[PDB]
Give the backbone structure.
Amino acid sequence: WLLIEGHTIGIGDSIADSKTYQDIQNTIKKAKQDVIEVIEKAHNNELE
Amino acid sequence: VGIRFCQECNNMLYPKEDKENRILLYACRNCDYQQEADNSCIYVNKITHEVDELTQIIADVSQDPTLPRTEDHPCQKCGHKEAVFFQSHSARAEDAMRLYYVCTAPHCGHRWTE
Ligand SMILES: [Zn+2]
Ligand SMILES: [Zn+2]
């Protein structure tokens, strides 16, 4: 049956939406800002 | 807190108590050279090891290329709104992530830690 219907994989199975890419970049930027914030707290010796 | 050496044979000095006058008497037992010590301290050991690292840092570390370079937090003796920040990174001497600021002026070198 797979001989008829066929299975594959390609580039189109990896591309996400532009809104998705914007959301992922926003999440990465927020994570980087948060780790910058916590390392700044660790720099000035307030991290208990 | 501090040690010194013998005079006429130039050897290392060992302690001795005095039987008569009850004063500590540093002396070289390769000699008969006896003298008193004004410090009145023989042995100190900071086991928790809170030494002052401000004398540990070389005043010339600021002119390193690959160290960071901040723009805020100016120096004290001179204004010079440019400084270098780093950590001690000394093993077994505490675990603090607190920063060691050095002024980067060529003739300055007043270092502070906030
Ligand atoms: Zn001697
Ligand atoms: Zn300075």
User: Anything to note?
Assistant: Chain B has two domains: 1-45, 46-114.
